[PDB]
Amino acid sequence: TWPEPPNYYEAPKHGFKVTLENPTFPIINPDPNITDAVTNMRSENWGVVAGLAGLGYVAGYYFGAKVHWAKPTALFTSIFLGKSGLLWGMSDSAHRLMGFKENSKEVAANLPHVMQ
Amino acid sequence: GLIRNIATFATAVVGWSVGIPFVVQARMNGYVERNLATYDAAQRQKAEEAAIGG
Amino acid sequence: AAAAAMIELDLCFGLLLLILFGLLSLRNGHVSLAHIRFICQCWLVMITPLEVQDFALCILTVVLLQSFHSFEALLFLLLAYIGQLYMMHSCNLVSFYVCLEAQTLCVVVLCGLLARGASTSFSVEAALKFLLLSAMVSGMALFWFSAMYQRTGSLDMVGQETFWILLVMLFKLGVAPMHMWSVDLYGSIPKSLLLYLSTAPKLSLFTFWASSWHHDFSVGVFILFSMFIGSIGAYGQPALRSLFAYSTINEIGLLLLAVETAGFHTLYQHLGIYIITQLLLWNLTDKRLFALCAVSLAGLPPFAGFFGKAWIFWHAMSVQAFSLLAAALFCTLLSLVYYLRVIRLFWTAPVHTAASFTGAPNQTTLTSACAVALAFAPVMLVKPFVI
Amino acid sequence: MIVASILILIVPVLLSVAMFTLAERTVMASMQRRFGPQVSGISGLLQPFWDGLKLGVKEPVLPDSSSAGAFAASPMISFVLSQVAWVGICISDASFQGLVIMAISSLAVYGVMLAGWASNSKYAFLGCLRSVALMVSYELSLGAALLSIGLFVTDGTGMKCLNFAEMPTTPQYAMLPLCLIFLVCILAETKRDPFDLPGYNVEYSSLGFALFFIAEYANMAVMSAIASIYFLGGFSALKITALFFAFVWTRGTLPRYRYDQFMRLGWKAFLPLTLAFFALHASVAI
Amino acid sequence: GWNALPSLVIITGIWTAGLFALDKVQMFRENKPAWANNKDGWQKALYRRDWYLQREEETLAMAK
Amino acid sequence: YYTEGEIFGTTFMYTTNMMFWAGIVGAVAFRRNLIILLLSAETVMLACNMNFLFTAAYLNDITGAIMSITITTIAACETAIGLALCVAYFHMRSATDVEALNMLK
Amino acid sequence: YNAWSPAQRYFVEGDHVVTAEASRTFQFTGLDSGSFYPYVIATVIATAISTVFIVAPLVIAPSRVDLDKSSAYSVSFYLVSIMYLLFDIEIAYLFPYAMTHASLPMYWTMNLFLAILVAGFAYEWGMGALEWRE
Amino acid sequence: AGMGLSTGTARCYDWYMDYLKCMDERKEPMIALRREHCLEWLEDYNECLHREKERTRRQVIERERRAQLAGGSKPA
Amino acid sequence: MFFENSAILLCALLSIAVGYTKSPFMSLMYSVMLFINSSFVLMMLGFEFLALVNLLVYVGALAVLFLFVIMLLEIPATELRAYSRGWSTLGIFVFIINGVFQITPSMGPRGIITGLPGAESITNLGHALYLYFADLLILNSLVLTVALFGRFAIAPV
Numbered sequence A: 001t002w003p004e005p006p007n008y009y010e011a012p013k014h015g016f017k018v019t020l021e022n023p024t025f026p027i028i029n030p031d032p033n034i035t036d037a038v039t040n041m042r043s044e045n046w047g048v049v050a051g052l053a054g055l056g057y058v059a060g061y062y063f064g065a066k067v068h069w070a071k072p073t074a075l076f077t078s079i080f081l082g083k084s085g086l087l088w089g090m091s092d093s094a095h096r097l098m099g100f101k102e103n104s105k106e107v108a109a110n111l112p113h114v115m116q
Numbered sequence B: 001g002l003i004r005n006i007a008t009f010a011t012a013v014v015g016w017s018v019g020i021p022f023v024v025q026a027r028m029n030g031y032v033e034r035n036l037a038t039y040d041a042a043q044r045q046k047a048e049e050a051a052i053g054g
Numbered sequence C: 001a002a003a004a005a006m007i008e009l010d011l012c013f014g015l016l017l018l019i020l021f022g023l024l025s026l027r028n029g030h031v032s033l034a035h036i037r038f039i040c041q042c043w044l045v046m047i048t049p050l051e052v053q054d055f056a057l058c059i060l061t062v063v064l065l066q067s068f069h070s071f072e073a074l075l076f077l078l079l080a081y082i083g084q085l086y087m088m089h090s091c092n093l094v095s096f097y098v099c100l101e102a103q104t105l106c107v108v109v110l111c112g113l114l115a116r117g118a119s120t121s122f123s124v125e126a127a128l129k130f131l132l133l134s135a136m137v138s139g140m141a142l143f144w145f146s147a148m149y150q151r152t153g154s155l156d157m158v159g160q161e162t163f164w165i166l167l168v169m170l171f172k173l174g175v176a177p178m179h180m181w182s183v184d185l186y187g188s189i190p191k192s193l194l195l196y197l198s199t200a201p202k203l204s205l206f207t208f209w210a211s212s213w214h215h216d217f218s219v220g221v222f223i224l225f226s227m228f229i230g231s232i233g234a235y236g237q238p239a240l241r242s243l244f245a246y247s248t249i250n251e252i253g254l255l256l257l258a259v260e261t262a263g264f265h266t267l268y269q270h271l272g273i274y275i276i277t278q279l280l281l282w283n284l285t286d287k288r289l290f291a292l293c294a295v296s297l298a299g300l301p302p303f304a305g306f307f308g309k310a311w312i313f314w315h316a317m318s319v320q321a322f323s324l325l326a327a328a329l330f331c332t333l334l335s336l337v338y339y340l341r342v343i344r345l346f347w348t349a350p351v352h353t354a355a356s357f358t359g360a361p362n363q364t365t366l367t368s369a370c371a372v373a374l375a376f377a378p379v380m381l382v383k384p385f386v387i
Numbered sequence D: 001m002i003v004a005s006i007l008i009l010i011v012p013v014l015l016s017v018a019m020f021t022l023a024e025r026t027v028m029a030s031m032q033r034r035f036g037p038q039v040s041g042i043s044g045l046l047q048p049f050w051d052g053l054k055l056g057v058k059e060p061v062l063p064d065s066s067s068a069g070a071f072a073a074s075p076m077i078s079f080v081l082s083q084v085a086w087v088g089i090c091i092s093d094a095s096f097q098g099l100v101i102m103a104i105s106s107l108a109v110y111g112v113m114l115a116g117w118a119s120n121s122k123y124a125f126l127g128c129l130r131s132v133a134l135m136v137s138y139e140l141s142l143g144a145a146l147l148s149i150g151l152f153v154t155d156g157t158g159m160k161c162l163n164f165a166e167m168p169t170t171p172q173y174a175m176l177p178l179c180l181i182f183l184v185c186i187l188a189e190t191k192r193d194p195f196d197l198p199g200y201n202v203e204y205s206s207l208g209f210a211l212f213f214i215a216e217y218a219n220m221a222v223m224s225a226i227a228s229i230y231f232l233g234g235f236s237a238l239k240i241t242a243l244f245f246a247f248v249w250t251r252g253t254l255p256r257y258r259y260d261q262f263m264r265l266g267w268k269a270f271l272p273l274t275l276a277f278f279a280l281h282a283s284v285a286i
Numbered sequence E: 001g002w003n004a005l006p007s008l009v010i011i012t013g014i015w016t017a018g019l020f021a022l023d024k025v026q027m028f029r030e031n032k033p034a035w036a037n038n039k040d041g042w043q044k045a046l047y048r049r050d051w052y053l054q055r056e057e058e059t060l061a062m063a064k
Numbered sequence F: 001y002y003t004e005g006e007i008f009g010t011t012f013m014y015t016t017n018m019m020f021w022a023g024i025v026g027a028v029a030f031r032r033n034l035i036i037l038l039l040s041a042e043t044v045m046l047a048c049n050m051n052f053l054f055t056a057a058y059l060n061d062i063t064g065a066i067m068s069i070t071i072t073t074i075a076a077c078e079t080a081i082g083l084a085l086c087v088a089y090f091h092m093r094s095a096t097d098v099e100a101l102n103m104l105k
Numbered sequence G: 001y002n003a004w005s006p007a008q009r010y011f012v013e014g015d016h017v018v019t020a021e022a023s024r025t026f027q028f029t030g031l032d033s034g035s036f037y038p039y040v041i042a043t044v045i046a047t048a049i050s051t052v053f054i055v056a057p058l059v060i061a062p063s064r065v066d067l068d069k070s071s072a073y074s075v076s077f078y079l080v081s082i083m084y085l086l087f088d089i090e091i092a093y094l095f096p097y098a099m100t101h102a103s104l105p106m107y108w109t110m111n112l113f114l115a116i117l118v119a120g121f122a123y124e125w126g127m128g129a130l131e132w133r134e
Numbered sequence H: 001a002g003m004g005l006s007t008g009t010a011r012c013y014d015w016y017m018d019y020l021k022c023m024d025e026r027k028e029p030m031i032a033l034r035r036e037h038c039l040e041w042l043e044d045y046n047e048c049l050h051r052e053k054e055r056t057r058r059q060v061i062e063r064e065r066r067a068q069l070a071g072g073s074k075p076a
Numbered sequence I: 001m002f003f004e005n006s007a008i009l010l011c012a013l014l015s016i017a018v019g020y021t022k023s024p025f026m027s028l029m030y031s032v033m034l035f036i037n038s039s040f041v042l043m044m045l046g047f048e049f050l051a052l053v054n055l056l057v058y059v060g061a062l063a064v065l066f067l068f069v070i071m072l073l074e075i076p077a078t079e080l081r082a083y084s085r086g087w088s089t090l091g092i093f094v095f096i097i098n099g100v101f102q103i104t105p106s107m108g109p110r111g112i113i114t115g116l117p118g119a120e121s122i123t124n125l126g127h128a129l130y131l132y133f134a135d136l137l138i139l140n141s142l143v144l145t146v147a148l149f150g151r152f153a154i155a156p157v
């Protein structure tokens, strides 16, 4: 009847895709930023980033050479596949930090005073 | 002519503004009548089920 | 937290980079864009989740992009793929409407853009008719969605208004008697868009149907209309484009018989075999393989079309849908006559295949020769495979 | 009381339009080392009134090859939209008042295009499309400028709006380039110098022509009041006169652009600048 | 020049007098010098409640 | 039996139903051009948009407003593409058709 | 418009309220906040004034019949009209952003929206479609 | 999708949530079988939405009021 | 409430009038009147911003494109069998059955509804568009991109 007095300055904390899970692993950080996601990324993620970049460079060099434009095509294709891999790796690291994936390696490295 | 067209538009607008509310009123009256019949039939069924259902 | 949405950000960033790369390549006067096509295929792979149907659509669209050459056509096909992918994940009528309308606009623009020669005005005419017929079906969808939203107060797809939404879905599959937009499209629009139109949207819409749709009604009269109209029309039309349009209406009637009796495994098997045959049909340069499409679309036994028809017939007989099954068997007996007409036209004739002169020598022999090996897939089809 | 308030608004609008068109003649004359109208009344103060009365007893030319209804409707539509926009300035309390006036001014295109369709002239059809293209092209920069303005307009309760009474009463020093773009956009909307190449009222005589010019000058006054509200810290009589003097001053000293030249200006200079300023102000406003 | 001064003075005087008269008229209509302020749903609810309670106070006054 | 609000609501719904069927049928019934067919399609979209906004007010719900914005976007895009195709077809076929934009003749 | 229910009148009983509402003066600080009703009256009054302007020279002016007095004395517009349509829709989308006190994820979503806009615009710039030579 | 237009949620959102909670807590292997056991909450949600039964009661009172004035016009 | 109900009922008259007339110019004029009147109808429901969007998009932008196309493409052929061929009686019967008698209405079994004004909040709309429906916002952007590229590719050269 009488509505609630609106709070104009407070926006709801909501991401448009909702995970509908509770985490099944210990929670190190419920909300990591990009620095937190990169600084706790595993070596296999960097390996697949470098593999995607190398495959992109080689394939872009092959396809860009038919129109005599091989070097910029190789550089662009390398960056394109590499950023795809980097987004994948950062998401994987953030999910391990939030507790939705296994983080036994991450719990023994991200809590220097809460090690044991 | 221009005067004929303006007069015809004014006539059509006024006739539409007086005639259609009677159509809507008749339709709403029919819905009220059918709803009251449904209420009476439901009351009759409830009395019958109370009579032979204990 | 937005960490569960990196694939969406990757989709948008990839589109932003691809437009700029396509602009830079065109400022050099490059008359070919194979590098743009490879980046488009990479983007297609990078945005697709790890389900069977999603990757079936992804691999299909990667194969389809080899028949398109301009930058704008590649952009329109990517933005149609976004609608085709996200319709399979749609759980409302909001996203359903937006995905369908994006696909319709992309198809209309591609029909306008790619026509050449004396057939340009015919293609534009058929695109205009398709757009006008699509607009009123979209209006019907919006109107009955508004009715459902007012009645239920929510976004659940339940109640009597789902019958009209079902009719919207049947329009998008070219189901007779709402079939004539596809018959108009087949007669004028070039072969690459005909190849695109017979494979990808049917997969997308049937996956939405399998995933998130229930109705309390039947589709049996549209099964009868599609099967009888498609068979008799393909028997009676001497132009080959109209033959294949009407035979497509017959095939969508069979797929609707698979939907109506439940059992979506037979639906998926027949649809996959049909899509591979379509990939062979519209990329043929040697006309002797046109007879293999004929014997595998007539349901003749050792080839894979027989298996795709025969699990539909088996599951229909399992749940005792006798009358629709009898109509399907009669129309199957009729379909053989015009597939034999195809065999008479292109197998019992002297062989002539012109060589290439400006390079690109018979450029899609790999895909056509790979898809002709649908005579070796039947060993895997007989097993409990598609379930 | 609403009818009374509207008529009491309408009286100084028309009186001011007459005095604007006189003041334009006389200021343009003073820049050119002459006098301008002085004979017609003492100090020339009756010249717009005798122009209006001369057009009143002038013969109305109704061409017997056009559609009479649209021909009559075009200057009526222009005049009505100007008066309604003034009412929206002064007799409204709406939350999105600037959006209301932007919507009204987007409707003002119709009088030009109805005049172009109605009259059977070869080059009226040619010039109406050019004038509409100019107005249409600069409306987008006006809208993006309104987007930049609305990022900082908040009332006392904390709600963001475009209500004119909630605008601050100090000049917006942070948005000087956007103010300059707004003023040149006003010049482009009113088809003044340097965008006066396209005219569309070549077949109109007497009070239809008078309605066209009253609508044009009233729209100029509307845009002047809007610019003074948005950038100059309020609506006032002095600010209206100063901005009108500035517009006449620019008309005295500059030549005009070609059609493709102001099209390239509006689609390659003003729109990217207003959008970039909107992005920068959105970054500031976080 | 001196010939351009009277029209420019008259424009200012016209707008001053017209805005003064329009202000007095709308002040007589609304009886408060904040009628043109932005109002949200809470403020609209407050004004409508005030109007209806004023009518109720008038109705109860003509009974004693 | 019924109140003024009920008259207002039933009048709104009757109006939008007749609007929807007018836009669907009428320009085809009167054998008009493709331009008028696109205008009537805009009438259909307007009827659906009014229904969604009425329901959004009726339920105190946001989904009708989202649908309203989306309908405006899709309708304008489809209409612009259709008019461009109409102009292209007219310039392609006017040498032999004269009445080229009328397919209901 | 008048209120038709006791709940719409804040549960005030009597007949004085019904007549007082039906014969009320328009007030932005009474029952008619944010009302847009003066916009309709302004249209009616201005249409009356312009009709009087149209009709009056048919009475008080000379007139002479002549057959010569009643006689006449690109695709870039398609580009402009369609581009203006799309850009106006985009600005209408951006307006609910500017009317909110937006948080940072709202800002980055809006910038993704604007980026898609300006990417299409920059493609049409680079292909020479905003050079109005024809 | 259940967000309010001027409020946080819609005016009948909690009735819908009651119905969906009932549907969640049943164990029947079909939705059509589960719906037969939550019909009271669906009825209360529909009554929140359209108020058909309150309107029906008011129509019945109006029929009796119109009957007690035509058949009964008793003067003092 | 005579004028409000009359303004509501006028929209259906203008919807019929768009197709009824033989002049394409008059059809567009009827459509412009209809969209202005509908924008005033939407503001009876409490929507201020969305009514202005209706006006600004449909009347301000799209009808200008309609009038340019009509004025560039329509040599007068109203005598040329637009009057001499008439209309379709089957289509008029379908319109009467479905839109006057309304045998299949949108409310279904219900016949009476209480119209309720809203209170539009643009803060709620901004929150919804940029937080809850953000994927739909981006896909609307992609549709507009399709429109821009597709028009510029289909522009007759």
Ligand SMILES: CCCCCCCCCCCCCCCCCC(=O)O[C@@H](COC(=O)CCCCCCCCCCCCCCC)COP(=O)(O)OC[C@H](O)CO
Residues within 6 Å of the ligand: A031, A032, A033, A034, A083, A086, C001, C002, C003, C005, C008, C009, C011, C012, C013, C082, C086, G104, G105, G108, G109, G112, I134, I135, I136, I138, I139
């Ligand atoms: C050349 C391309 C290279 C790309 C790769 C390099 C560039 C870096 C990638 C961009 C940034 C990283 C990705 C997103 C990071 C989100 C993680 C996060 O939490 O960051 C912030 C999250 O904020 C964001 O920036 C959110 C981004 C929202 C993006 C919305 C749109 C998503 C895409 C929708 C597309 C729709 C689908 C289209 C098809 C249907 C806030 O950090 P916090 O929570 O620690 O800080 C708290 C503070 O108070 C503010 O919250």
Ligand SMILES: COC1=C(OC)C(=O)C(C/C=C(\C)CC/C=C(\C)CC/C=C(\C)CC/C=C(\C)CCC=C(C)C)=C(C)C1=O
Residues within 6 Å of the ligand: D014, D015, D017, D018, D021, D022, D024, D025, D047, D048, D049, D051, D052, D210, D213, D214
């Ligand atoms: C270089 O620029 C210019 C032009 O080119 C663009 C021009 O064309 C004109 C000439 C055109 C004019 C003046 C027409 C426009 C103005 C009009 C009709 C004046 C409007 C005034 C009104 C309505 C008030 C006068 C009426 C009164 C006082 C009522 C009288 C009643 C009684 C006595 C009972 C001028 C001056 C000009 O500078």
